[PDB]
């Protein structure tokens, strides 16, 4: 009876196995754009993905991860609110059954169709497993998806999904360039939070970009053909793999822009 996104194992149940679900810095949150304060002391983000080495795509039963070689400083996130150098390990999405829901963060209560998470770990902690035990261990770059024009740089991801339909399936996924998933502007909001899935560890500096990327209805329809189940198990579409907004508590969301 493992955690998931169903009636019987979804976000309202997670606190029984993961009591930090009711913690002081849980994610996601609603971003109240009028309350977020411009912090003129933040720096421009530095997103340096030129040397990225993608390896593999995995359906883990909750989402799909595009995994990177993080055994060297290749693809790194620095600057903005961050102290030091954060190495890209994987990206994944959260998405809806319908275009009107799917994002985890909201903006003035607006839900986007999906949300991309580019996961990075602080290299001062040596490995990802050590980094998730630290309050500044991860930096996740969150990018909203709206449905309109296709995103050409997403199509290589879309077109491999039929090969990882079910939980535990993986496929080689080399030479994928995550720069093709970024919007034009790196204006962002930032706050201290958590993983949005179990184990819900409070180890994340969130950096949520203001500008969404546009994807086509056909692109997101292909996300929605994935399965939560394993091969040879009843088909359960992988949709609505998002956690709703959690209490902000004693936190401030800072803006990089006026
Ligand atoms: C996950 C999955 C299964 C079967 C077909 C598709 C298409 O892209 Se069409 C995707
Ligand atoms: C379980 C886990 C590990 C690393 C990152 C996440 C998210 O971005 Se949500 C979740
Ligand atoms: Zn995520």
């Amino acid at each position: 009876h493992h955690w998931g996104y169903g009636k019987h194992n979804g976000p309202e149940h997670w606190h029984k196995d993961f009591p930090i679900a009711k913690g002081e810095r849980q994610s996601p949150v609603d971003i109240d754009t009028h309350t977020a304060k411009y912090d003129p002391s933040l720096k421009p983000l530095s997103v340096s993905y030129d040397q990225a080495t993608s390896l593999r795509i995995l359906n883990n039963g909750h989402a799909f991860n595009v995994e990177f070689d993080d055994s060297q400083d290749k693809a790194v996130l620095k600057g903005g609110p961050l102290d030091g150098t954060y190495r890209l390990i994987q990206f994944h999405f959260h998405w809806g059954s319908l275009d009107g829901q799917g994002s985890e963060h909201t903006v003035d209560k607006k839900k986007y169709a999906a949300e991309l998470h580019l996961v990075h770990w602080n290299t001062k902690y040596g490995d990802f497993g050590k980094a998730v035990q630290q309050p500044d261990g991860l930096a996740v770059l969150g990018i909203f998806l709206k449905v309109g024009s296709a995103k050409p740089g997403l199509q290589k991801v879309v077109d491999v999904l039929d090969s990882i339909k079910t939980k535990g399936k993986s496929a080689d996924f080399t030479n994928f360039d995550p720069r093709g998933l970024l919007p034009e502007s790196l204006d962002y909001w930032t706050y201290p939070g958590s993983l949005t899935t179990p184990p819900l560890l409070e180890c994340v500096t969130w950096i949520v970009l203001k500008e969404p990327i546009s994807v086509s209805s056909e692109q997101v329809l292909k996300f929605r053909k994935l399965n939560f189940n394993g091969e040879g198990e009843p088909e359960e579409l992988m949709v609505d793999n998002w956690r709703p907004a959690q209490p902000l508590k004693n936190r401030q969301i800072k803006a990089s822009f006026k």
Side-chain angles (χ1 to χ4, degrees):
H1 191 82
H2 181 270
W3 72 265
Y5 293 98
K7 178 75 145 146
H8 292 289
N9 67 356
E12 303 314 310
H13 293 272
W14 295 347
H15 70 101
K16 286 175 278 173
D17 274 344
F18 304 97
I20 203 171
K22 297 186 165 354
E24 294 309 305
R25 58 173 279 186
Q26 287 293 289
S27 295
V29 298
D30 183 53
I31 301 163
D32 188 80
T33 65
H34 283 110
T35 301
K37 193 190 166 82
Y38 170 60
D39 183 353
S41 76
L42 285 168
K43 301 158 202 152
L45 257 198
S46 174
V47 185
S48 299
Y49 288 169
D50 179 62
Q51 294 290 273
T53 294
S54 64
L55 290 175
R56 194 179 70 139
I57 195 174
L58 171 70
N59 179 331
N60 62 20
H62 309 293
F64 66 85
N65 290 352
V66 174
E67 296 162 355
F68 290 79
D69 170 18
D70 66 344
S71 72
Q72 295 189 264
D73 270 334
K74 291 185 166 188
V76 301
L77 185 69
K78 300 175 303 102
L82 308 172
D83 293 347
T85 294
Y86 290 71
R87 194 174 287 179
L88 179 63
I89 177 166
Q90 53 111 321
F91 72 78
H92 62 273
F93 303 83
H94 305 261
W95 65 88
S97 51
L98 304 159
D99 294 347
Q101 62 200 61
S103 66
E104 297 209 298
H105 296 90
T106 59
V107 178
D108 296 335
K109 296 302 180 72
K110 179 190 173 63
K111 299 173 162 75
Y112 289 89
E115 188 176 327
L116 168 61
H117 290 166
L118 298 132
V119 183
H120 314 72
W121 58 270
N122 193 331
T123 62
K124 78 189 193 148
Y125 301 121
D127 67 67
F128 173 78
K130 287 304 254 312
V132 298
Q133 294 180 69
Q134 310 294 334
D136 59 350
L138 299 192
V140 183
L141 180 62
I143 304 176
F144 296 117
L145 282 62
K146 64 180 187 186
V147 172
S149 306
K151 193 64 170 188
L154 181 60
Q155 191 62 32
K156 279 160 82 175
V157 171
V158 166
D159 277 336
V160 78
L161 297 177
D162 71 296
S163 73
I164 58 154
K165 184 177 184 187
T166 51
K167 178 177 42 172
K169 294 203 162 284
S170 67
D172 306 306
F173 201 70
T174 60
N175 299 292
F176 178 78
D177 188 343
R179 294 178 292 186
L181 298 175
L182 304 175
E184 284 175 6
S185 179
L186 295 185
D187 289 348
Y188 65 86
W189 299 280
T190 183
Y191 75 96
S194 72
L195 311 180
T196 68
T197 76
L200 298 165
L201 295 170
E202 292 183 335
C203 61
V204 182
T205 301
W206 280 96
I207 300 169
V208 177
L209 295 190
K210 172 184 69 170
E211 185 184 328
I213 60 164
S214 286
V215 302
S216 66
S217 187
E218 294 87 354
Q219 284 180 322
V220 67
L221 281 164
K222 288 177 180 185
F223 283 17
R224 296 179 186 137
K225 292 174 165 64
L226 289 166
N227 285 185
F228 284 128
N229 52 281
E231 187 179 10
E233 292 173 5
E235 187 175 31
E236 195 49 11
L237 295 178
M238 183 180 284
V239 295
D240 295 319
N241 58 351
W242 52 275
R243 187 192 196 187
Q246 300 300 309
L248 187 61
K249 295 183 171 172
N250 186 44
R251 294 178 286 183
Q252 276 189 337
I253 305 181
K254 294 199 272 250
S256 77
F257 61 91
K258 284 186 186 68

mmCIF file of all heavy atoms in Angstrom, residues 164-201:
data_model
loop_
_atom_site.group_PDB
_atom_site.id
_atom_site.type_symbol
_atom_site.label_atom_id
_atom_site.label_comp_id
_atom_site.label_asym_id
_atom_site.label_seq_id
_atom_site.Cartn_x
_atom_site.Cartn_y
_atom_site.Cartn_z
ATOM 1 N N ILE A 164 8.839 3.580 -22.655
ATOM 2 C CA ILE A 164 8.905 3.483 -21.172
ATOM 3 C C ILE A 164 7.500 3.647 -20.607
ATOM 4 O O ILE A 164 7.268 4.377 -19.642
ATOM 5 C CB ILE A 164 9.896 4.514 -20.603
ATOM 6 C CG1 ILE A 164 9.544 5.940 -20.985
ATOM 7 C CG2 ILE A 164 11.308 4.171 -21.075
ATOM 8 C CD1 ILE A 164 10.052 6.945 -20.001
ATOM 9 N N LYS A 165 6.558 2.975 -21.226
ATOM 10 C CA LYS A 165 5.140 3.198 -20.900
ATOM 11 C C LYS A 165 4.864 2.914 -19.439
ATOM 12 O O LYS A 165 4.045 3.614 -18.845
ATOM 13 C CB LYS A 165 4.229 2.334 -21.774
ATOM 14 C CG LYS A 165 2.758 2.609 -21.540
ATOM 15 C CD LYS A 165 1.917 1.778 -22.490
ATOM 16 C CE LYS A 165 0.451 2.092 -22.355
ATOM 17 N NZ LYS A 165 -0.396 1.174 -23.154
ATOM 18 N N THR A 166 5.476 1.869 -18.886
ATOM 19 C CA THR A 166 5.103 1.323 -17.562
ATOM 20 C C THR A 166 6.250 1.460 -16.568
ATOM 21 O O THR A 166 7.453 1.588 -16.922
ATOM 22 C CB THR A 166 4.649 -0.131 -17.714
ATOM 23 O OG1 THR A 166 5.646 -0.839 -18.454
ATOM 24 C CG2 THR A 166 3.314 -0.197 -18.432
ATOM 25 N N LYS A 167 5.885 1.389 -15.302
ATOM 26 C CA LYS A 167 6.784 1.514 -14.159
ATOM 27 C C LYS A 167 7.955 0.567 -14.283
ATOM 28 O O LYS A 167 7.718 -0.652 -14.513
ATOM 29 C CB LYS A 167 5.999 1.242 -12.881
ATOM 30 C CG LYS A 167 6.815 1.294 -11.598
ATOM 31 C CD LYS A 167 5.983 1.081 -10.353
ATOM 32 C CE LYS A 167 4.928 -0.008 -10.456
ATOM 33 N NZ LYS A 167 4.303 -0.281 -9.143
ATOM 34 N N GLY A 168 9.164 1.072 -14.083
ATOM 35 C CA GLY A 168 10.421 0.292 -14.084
ATOM 36 C C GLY A 168 11.050 0.216 -15.450
ATOM 37 O O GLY A 168 12.183 -0.298 -15.540
ATOM 38 N N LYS A 169 10.398 0.635 -16.508
ATOM 39 C CA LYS A 169 11.020 0.668 -17.851
ATOM 40 C C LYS A 169 11.961 1.846 -18.004
ATOM 41 O O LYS A 169 11.644 2.947 -17.555
ATOM 42 C CB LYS A 169 9.949 0.690 -18.939
ATOM 43 C CG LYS A 169 9.121 -0.590 -19.014
ATOM 44 C CD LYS A 169 8.462 -0.846 -20.357
ATOM 45 C CE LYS A 169 8.011 -2.282 -20.551
ATOM 46 N NZ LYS A 169 9.127 -3.216 -20.840
ATOM 47 N N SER A 170 13.073 1.607 -18.642
ATOM 48 C CA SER A 170 14.065 2.657 -18.947
ATOM 49 C C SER A 170 14.469 2.511 -20.410
ATOM 50 O O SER A 170 14.327 1.401 -21.028
ATOM 51 C CB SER A 170 15.231 2.644 -18.039
ATOM 52 O OG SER A 170 16.037 1.482 -18.207
ATOM 53 N N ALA A 171 15.070 3.548 -20.933
ATOM 54 C CA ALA A 171 15.608 3.566 -22.307
ATOM 55 C C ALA A 171 16.841 4.448 -22.354
ATOM 56 O O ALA A 171 16.938 5.468 -21.652
ATOM 57 C CB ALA A 171 14.559 4.006 -23.291
ATOM 58 N N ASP A 172 17.807 4.086 -23.196
ATOM 59 C CA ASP A 172 18.951 4.992 -23.429
ATOM 60 C C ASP A 172 18.383 6.341 -23.921
ATOM 61 O O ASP A 172 17.372 6.411 -24.668
ATOM 62 C CB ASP A 172 19.986 4.356 -24.369
ATOM 63 C CG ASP A 172 20.515 2.981 -23.994
ATOM 64 O OD1 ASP A 172 21.009 2.801 -22.850
ATOM 65 O OD2 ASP A 172 20.541 2.111 -24.905
ATOM 66 N N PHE A 173 19.005 7.417 -23.456
ATOM 67 C CA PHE A 173 18.555 8.782 -23.794
ATOM 68 C C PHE A 173 19.755 9.692 -23.735
ATOM 69 O O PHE A 173 19.827 10.571 -22.920
ATOM 70 C CB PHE A 173 17.391 9.209 -22.889
ATOM 71 C CG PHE A 173 16.569 10.322 -23.482
ATOM 72 C CD1 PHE A 173 15.782 10.074 -24.582
ATOM 73 C CD2 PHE A 173 16.608 11.602 -22.970
ATOM 74 C CE1 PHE A 173 15.046 11.096 -25.166
ATOM 75 C CE2 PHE A 173 15.807 12.599 -23.492
ATOM 76 C CZ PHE A 173 15.072 12.352 -24.613
ATOM 77 N N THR A 174 20.679 9.482 -24.658
ATOM 78 C CA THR A 174 21.899 10.279 -24.812
ATOM 79 C C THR A 174 21.689 11.499 -25.698
ATOM 80 O O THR A 174 20.788 11.521 -26.527
ATOM 81 C CB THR A 174 23.052 9.382 -25.264
ATOM 82 O OG1 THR A 174 22.711 8.786 -26.520
ATOM 83 C CG2 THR A 174 23.452 8.407 -24.183
ATOM 84 N N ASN A 175 22.555 12.480 -25.485
ATOM 85 C CA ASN A 175 22.727 13.693 -26.318
ATOM 86 C C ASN A 175 21.474 14.572 -26.298
ATOM 87 O O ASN A 175 21.229 15.277 -27.269
ATOM 88 C CB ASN A 175 23.146 13.339 -27.739
ATOM 89 C CG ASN A 175 24.473 12.622 -27.735
ATOM 90 O OD1 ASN A 175 25.509 13.211 -27.409
ATOM 91 N ND2 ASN A 175 24.406 11.323 -27.949
ATOM 92 N N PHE A 176 20.690 14.541 -25.237
ATOM 93 C CA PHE A 176 19.501 15.430 -25.118
ATOM 94 C C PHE A 176 19.981 16.738 -24.471
ATOM 95 O O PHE A 176 20.671 16.714 -23.453
ATOM 96 C CB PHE A 176 18.422 14.797 -24.255
ATOM 97 C CG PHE A 176 17.272 15.763 -24.136
ATOM 98 C CD1 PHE A 176 16.373 15.915 -25.165
ATOM 99 C CD2 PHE A 176 17.146 16.570 -23.021
ATOM 100 C CE1 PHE A 176 15.378 16.871 -25.122
ATOM 101 C CE2 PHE A 176 16.125 17.502 -22.953
ATOM 102 C CZ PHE A 176 15.235 17.636 -23.983
ATOM 103 N N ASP A 177 19.644 17.864 -25.070
ATOM 104 C CA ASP A 177 20.127 19.187 -24.631
ATOM 105 C C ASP A 177 19.038 19.917 -23.862
ATOM 106 O O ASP A 177 18.041 20.374 -24.430
ATOM 107 C CB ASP A 177 20.516 20.017 -25.841
ATOM 108 C CG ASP A 177 21.203 21.306 -25.438
ATOM 109 O OD1 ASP A 177 21.120 21.739 -24.270
ATOM 110 O OD2 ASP A 177 21.889 21.854 -26.337
ATOM 111 N N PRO A 178 19.149 19.995 -22.524
ATOM 112 C CA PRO A 178 18.053 20.586 -21.720
ATOM 113 C C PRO A 178 17.910 22.106 -21.929
ATOM 114 O O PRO A 178 16.906 22.678 -21.537
ATOM 115 C CB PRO A 178 18.422 20.219 -20.290
ATOM 116 C CG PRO A 178 19.904 20.063 -20.283
ATOM 117 C CD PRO A 178 20.253 19.516 -21.667
ATOM 118 N N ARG A 179 18.864 22.730 -22.620
ATOM 119 C CA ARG A 179 18.729 24.188 -22.964
ATOM 120 C C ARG A 179 17.475 24.367 -23.810
ATOM 121 O O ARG A 179 16.898 25.469 -23.796
ATOM 122 C CB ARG A 179 19.956 24.733 -23.703
ATOM 123 C CG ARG A 179 21.181 24.726 -22.813
ATOM 124 C CD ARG A 179 22.438 25.205 -23.488
ATOM 125 N NE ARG A 179 22.852 24.272 -24.492
ATOM 126 C CZ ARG A 179 23.979 24.342 -25.178
ATOM 127 N NH1 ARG A 179 24.812 25.347 -24.986
ATOM 128 N NH2 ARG A 179 24.264 23.414 -26.076
ATOM 129 N N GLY A 180 17.036 23.376 -24.579
ATOM 130 C CA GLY A 180 15.852 23.543 -25.428
ATOM 131 C C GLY A 180 14.560 23.503 -24.634
ATOM 132 O O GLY A 180 13.494 23.574 -25.269
ATOM 133 N N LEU A 181 14.615 23.350 -23.306
ATOM 134 C CA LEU A 181 13.403 23.389 -22.465
ATOM 135 C C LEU A 181 13.256 24.735 -21.740
ATOM 136 O O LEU A 181 12.302 24.846 -20.914
ATOM 137 C CB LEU A 181 13.414 22.245 -21.458
ATOM 138 C CG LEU A 181 13.414 20.864 -22.111
ATOM 139 C CD1 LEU A 181 13.547 19.817 -21.049
ATOM 140 C CD2 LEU A 181 12.151 20.673 -22.917
ATOM 141 N N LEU A 182 14.184 25.672 -21.881
ATOM 142 C CA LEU A 182 14.183 26.935 -21.096
ATOM 143 C C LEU A 182 13.399 28.022 -21.817
ATOM 144 O O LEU A 182 13.521 28.199 -23.027
ATOM 145 C CB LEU A 182 15.610 27.426 -20.848
ATOM 146 C CG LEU A 182 16.557 26.449 -20.165
ATOM 147 C CD1 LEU A 182 17.967 26.995 -20.075
ATOM 148 C CD2 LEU A 182 16.022 26.038 -18.795
ATOM 149 N N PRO A 183 12.685 28.887 -21.088
ATOM 150 C CA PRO A 183 12.083 30.076 -21.685
ATOM 151 C C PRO A 183 13.177 31.115 -21.959
ATOM 152 O O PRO A 183 14.335 30.945 -21.591
ATOM 153 C CB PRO A 183 11.099 30.484 -20.609
ATOM 154 C CG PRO A 183 11.827 30.133 -19.344
ATOM 155 C CD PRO A 183 12.474 28.783 -19.640
ATOM 156 N N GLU A 184 12.788 32.241 -22.556
ATOM 157 C CA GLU A 184 13.753 33.303 -22.909
ATOM 158 C C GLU A 184 14.284 33.958 -21.650
ATOM 159 O O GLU A 184 15.486 34.170 -21.493
ATOM 160 C CB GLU A 184 13.118 34.441 -23.722
ATOM 161 C CG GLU A 184 12.866 34.114 -25.141
ATOM 162 C CD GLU A 184 12.137 35.227 -25.875
ATOM 163 O OE1 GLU A 184 11.921 36.304 -25.294
ATOM 164 O OE2 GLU A 184 11.832 34.992 -27.051
ATOM 165 N N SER A 185 13.372 34.299 -20.731
ATOM 166 C CA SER A 185 13.724 35.049 -19.512
ATOM 167 C C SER A 185 14.052 34.111 -18.360
ATOM 168 O O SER A 185 13.344 33.109 -18.180
ATOM 169 C CB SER A 185 12.561 35.936 -19.094
ATOM 170 O OG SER A 185 12.883 36.660 -17.891
ATOM 171 N N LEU A 186 15.050 34.459 -17.583
ATOM 172 C CA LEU A 186 15.372 33.740 -16.311
ATOM 173 C C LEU A 186 14.892 34.518 -15.083
ATOM 174 O O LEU A 186 15.352 34.199 -13.996
ATOM 175 C CB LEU A 186 16.882 33.520 -16.257
ATOM 176 C CG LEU A 186 17.490 32.612 -17.310
ATOM 177 C CD1 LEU A 186 18.978 32.414 -17.011
ATOM 178 C CD2 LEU A 186 16.768 31.277 -17.344
ATOM 179 N N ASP A 187 13.973 35.439 -15.213
ATOM 180 C CA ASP A 187 13.308 36.080 -14.048
ATOM 181 C C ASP A 187 12.654 34.971 -13.207
ATOM 182 O O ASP A 187 12.037 34.047 -13.764
ATOM 183 C CB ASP A 187 12.246 37.109 -14.465
ATOM 184 C CG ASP A 187 12.760 38.429 -15.072
ATOM 185 O OD1 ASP A 187 13.916 38.669 -14.977
ATOM 186 O OD2 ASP A 187 11.938 39.113 -15.689
ATOM 187 N N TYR A 188 12.755 35.070 -11.903
ATOM 188 C CA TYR A 188 12.318 33.970 -11.024
ATOM 189 C C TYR A 188 11.787 34.473 -9.700
ATOM 190 O O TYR A 188 12.091 35.605 -9.234
ATOM 191 C CB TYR A 188 13.464 32.974 -10.817
ATOM 192 C CG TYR A 188 14.655 33.508 -10.078
ATOM 193 C CD1 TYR A 188 14.722 33.509 -8.696
ATOM 194 C CD2 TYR A 188 15.738 34.016 -10.770
ATOM 195 C CE1 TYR A 188 15.826 33.984 -8.026
ATOM 196 C CE2 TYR A 188 16.856 34.509 -10.124
ATOM 197 C CZ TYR A 188 16.877 34.543 -8.738
ATOM 198 O OH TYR A 188 17.935 35.105 -8.066
ATOM 199 N N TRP A 189 11.105 33.543 -9.040
ATOM 200 C CA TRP A 189 10.765 33.610 -7.608
ATOM 201 C C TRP A 189 11.571 32.547 -6.873
ATOM 202 O O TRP A 189 11.851 31.483 -7.462
ATOM 203 C CB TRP A 189 9.286 33.389 -7.335
ATOM 204 C CG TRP A 189 8.379 34.385 -7.971
ATOM 205 C CD1 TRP A 189 8.117 35.641 -7.504
ATOM 206 C CD2 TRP A 189 7.531 34.190 -9.109
ATOM 207 N NE1 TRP A 189 7.160 36.233 -8.294
ATOM 208 C CE2 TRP A 189 6.799 35.379 -9.304
ATOM 209 C CE3 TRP A 189 7.356 33.124 -9.989
ATOM 210 C CZ2 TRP A 189 5.876 35.510 -10.345
ATOM 211 C CZ3 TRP A 189 6.415 33.255 -10.982
ATOM 212 C CH2 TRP A 189 5.701 34.426 -11.165
ATOM 213 N N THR A 190 11.889 32.779 -5.617
ATOM 214 C CA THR A 190 12.672 31.789 -4.853
ATOM 215 C C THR A 190 12.188 31.731 -3.411
ATOM 216 O O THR A 190 11.815 32.731 -2.826
ATOM 217 C CB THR A 190 14.176 32.021 -4.967
ATOM 218 O OG1 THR A 190 14.896 31.016 -4.287
ATOM 219 C CG2 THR A 190 14.629 33.337 -4.355
ATOM 220 N N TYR A 191 12.211 30.542 -2.840
ATOM 221 C CA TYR A 191 11.859 30.315 -1.433
ATOM 222 C C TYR A 191 12.428 28.975 -1.015
ATOM 223 O O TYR A 191 12.719 28.109 -1.845
ATOM 224 C CB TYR A 191 10.337 30.344 -1.239
ATOM 225 C CG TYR A 191 9.623 29.126 -1.726
ATOM 226 C CD1 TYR A 191 9.318 28.114 -0.849
ATOM 227 C CD2 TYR A 191 9.354 28.924 -3.074
ATOM 228 C CE1 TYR A 191 8.709 26.954 -1.293
ATOM 229 C CE2 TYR A 191 8.787 27.765 -3.545
ATOM 230 C CZ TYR A 191 8.467 26.764 -2.635
ATOM 231 O OH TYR A 191 7.912 25.565 -3.012
ATOM 232 N N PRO A 192 12.594 28.768 0.299
ATOM 233 C CA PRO A 192 13.064 27.502 0.824
ATOM 234 C C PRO A 192 11.926 26.471 0.960
ATOM 235 O O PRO A 192 10.888 26.807 1.585
ATOM 236 C CB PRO A 192 13.598 27.837 2.226
ATOM 237 C CG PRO A 192 12.849 29.071 2.646
ATOM 238 C CD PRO A 192 12.483 29.774 1.353
ATOM 239 N N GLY A 193 12.091 25.280 0.457
ATOM 240 C CA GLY A 193 11.025 24.275 0.537
ATOM 241 C C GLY A 193 11.546 22.884 0.537
ATOM 242 O O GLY A 193 12.616 22.540 1.112
ATOM 243 N N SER A 194 10.792 22.018 -0.117
ATOM 244 C CA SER A 194 10.924 20.546 0.014
ATOM 245 C C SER A 194 10.827 19.833 -1.326
ATOM 246 O O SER A 194 10.365 20.433 -2.320
ATOM 247 C CB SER A 194 9.912 19.927 0.980
ATOM 248 O OG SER A 194 8.599 19.929 0.404
ATOM 249 N N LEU A 195 11.158 18.549 -1.323
ATOM 250 C CA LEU A 195 10.676 17.668 -2.400
ATOM 251 C C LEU A 195 9.159 17.681 -2.399
ATOM 252 O O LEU A 195 8.536 17.793 -1.306
ATOM 253 C CB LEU A 195 11.144 16.247 -2.162
ATOM 254 C CG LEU A 195 12.621 16.058 -1.850
ATOM 255 C CD1 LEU A 195 12.920 14.570 -1.638
ATOM 256 C CD2 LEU A 195 13.498 16.619 -2.942
ATOM 257 N N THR A 196 8.515 17.533 -3.543
ATOM 258 C CA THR A 196 7.030 17.534 -3.593
ATOM 259 C C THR A 196 6.482 16.117 -3.596
ATOM 260 O O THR A 196 5.255 16.004 -3.658
ATOM 261 C CB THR A 196 6.517 18.340 -4.791
ATOM 262 O OG1 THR A 196 6.890 17.594 -5.949
ATOM 263 C CG2 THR A 196 7.062 19.744 -4.846
ATOM 264 N N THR A 197 7.335 15.131 -3.500
ATOM 265 C CA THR A 197 6.903 13.728 -3.347
ATOM 266 C C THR A 197 7.594 13.204 -2.112
ATOM 267 O O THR A 197 8.661 13.683 -1.716
ATOM 268 C CB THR A 197 7.288 12.841 -4.546
ATOM 269 O OG1 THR A 197 8.679 12.527 -4.504
ATOM 270 C CG2 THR A 197 6.971 13.481 -5.879
ATOM 271 N N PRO A 198 7.056 12.113 -1.507
ATOM 272 C CA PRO A 198 7.796 11.381 -0.502
ATOM 273 C C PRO A 198 9.209 11.139 -1.013
ATOM 274 O O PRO A 198 9.368 10.805 -2.203
ATOM 275 C CB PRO A 198 6.919 10.145 -0.294
ATOM 276 C CG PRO A 198 5.543 10.638 -0.551
ATOM 277 C CD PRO A 198 5.727 11.538 -1.760
ATOM 278 N N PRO A 199 10.253 11.247 -0.178
ATOM 279 C CA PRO A 199 10.131 11.464 1.281
ATOM 280 C C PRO A 199 9.954 12.911 1.780
ATOM 281 O O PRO A 199 10.066 13.146 2.960
ATOM 282 C CB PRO A 199 11.468 10.892 1.757
ATOM 283 C CG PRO A 199 12.447 11.167 0.614
ATOM 284 C CD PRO A 199 11.618 10.902 -0.609
ATOM 285 N N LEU A 200 9.661 13.865 0.896
ATOM 286 C CA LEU A 200 9.222 15.245 1.247
ATOM 287 C C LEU A 200 10.315 15.975 2.047
ATOM 288 O O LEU A 200 10.014 16.861 2.825
ATOM 289 C CB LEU A 200 7.892 15.228 2.009
ATOM 290 C CG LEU A 200 6.725 14.643 1.213
ATOM 291 C CD1 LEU A 200 5.545 14.316 2.135
ATOM 292 C CD2 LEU A 200 6.291 15.556 0.058
ATOM 293 N N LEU A 201 11.572 15.645 1.779
ATOM 294 C CA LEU A 201 12.699 16.179 2.577
ATOM 295 C C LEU A 201 12.797 17.687 2.361
ATOM 296 O O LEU A 201 12.642 18.179 1.208
ATOM 297 C CB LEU A 201 14.014 15.486 2.198
ATOM 298 C CG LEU A 201 14.038 13.991 2.547
ATOM 299 C CD1 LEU A 201 15.235 13.309 1.931
ATOM 300 C CD2 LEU A 201 14.057 13.757 4.051
#
